[PDB]
């Protein structure tokens, strides 16, 4: 699924923390 809408409301650090959770 698309992640853009989620990442648009997260900080850069929160974004990378989410992305690293999903790896």
């Amino acid at each position, epitope marked *: *699924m*698309e*992640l*853009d809408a989620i*990442l*648009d409301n997260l900080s*850069d650090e929160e*974004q*990378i923390e989410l*992305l*690293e959770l*999903l*790896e």
Partner: antibody, heavy 130, light 110 residues
Framework: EVQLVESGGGLVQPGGSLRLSCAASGFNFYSSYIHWVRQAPGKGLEWVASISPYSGSTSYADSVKGRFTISADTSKNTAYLQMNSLRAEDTAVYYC???????????????????????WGQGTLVTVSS | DIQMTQSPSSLSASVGDRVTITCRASQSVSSAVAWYQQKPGKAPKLLIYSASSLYSGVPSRFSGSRSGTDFTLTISSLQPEDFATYYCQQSVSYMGPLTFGQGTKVEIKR
């Protein structure tokens, strides 16, 4: 097929303005991110700006903040880069390019997938000179 | 900001050789790394996306791998038409700054 055609480049005196346009043909423009990426003669690639054409959200490189404005018309499937206060260091070939949406997706059992610039226009040359 | 340090700035190799180009991200960029090939006077062409996925239509000798913040473009069997400048590019910041990496000029040795 998929095409990006750039227009509006040319010679302009220091401090002047130019407006680049990028007409997109064979793909959903509402479902894309548009980027302007420039290359000064003999130098590397430098990202300039990004836009999501439907929501109009934009991002700029620090080198151009306040001077450049990226915009898009979803009716004409055309993105635009309005460049003000041009300096010699702005001299470059300006490329239009595209991310197909989404920027990043996640699929269970397969992981993350990040979009990349798969379609680029041929470029338009901007020369800032007296 | 987030820097892509692309080593060797240039290299020369013979037809058929295996060539590797490296890109170190100054911090985590996940797999948000693309590899482009640019021939003179032309727009860059996408080779690798999402750090390891071969773009459709690209010859199989191009491949990308990731280990942490190190990204490797491998050309396993160098062809004369591979003369070009190659660039990595990160996109880990959603609608944030995209940075490239200085490029690698690949000359063909004959």
């Amino acid at each position: 097929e998929v095409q990006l055609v750039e227009s509006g480049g040319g010679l302009v005196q220091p401090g002047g303005s130019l407006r680049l346009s990028c007409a997109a043909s064979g793909f959903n423009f509402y479902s894309s991110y548009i980027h302007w990426v420039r290359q000064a003669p003999g130098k590397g690639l430098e990202w300039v700006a990004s836009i999501s054409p439907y929501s109009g959200s934009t991002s700029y490189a620090d080198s151009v903040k306040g001077r450049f404005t990226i915009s898009a018309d979803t009716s004409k499937n055309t993105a635009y880069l309005q460049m003000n206060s041009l300096r010699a260091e702005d001299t470059a070939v300006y490329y239009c390019a595209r991310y197909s949406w989404p920027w990043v997706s996640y699929k269970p059992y397969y992981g993350l997938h990040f979009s990349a610039m798969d379609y680029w226009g041929q470029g338009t040359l901007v020369t800032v000179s007296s | 900001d987030i820097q892509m340090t692309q080593s060797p700035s240039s290299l020369s190799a013979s037809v058929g050789d295996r060539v590797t180009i490296t890109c170190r991200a100054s911090q985590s960029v996940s797999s948000a790394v693309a590899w482009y090939q640019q021939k003179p006077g032309k727009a860059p062409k996408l080779l690798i996306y999402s750090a390891s996925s071969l773009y459709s239509g690209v010859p199989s000798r191009f491949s990308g791998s990731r280990s942490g913040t190190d990204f490797t473009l491998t050309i396993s069997s160098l062809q004369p038409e591979d003369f070009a400048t190659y660039y990595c590019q990160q996109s880990v910041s959603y609608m944030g700054p995209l940075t490239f990496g200085q490029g690698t000029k690949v000359e063909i040795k004959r």
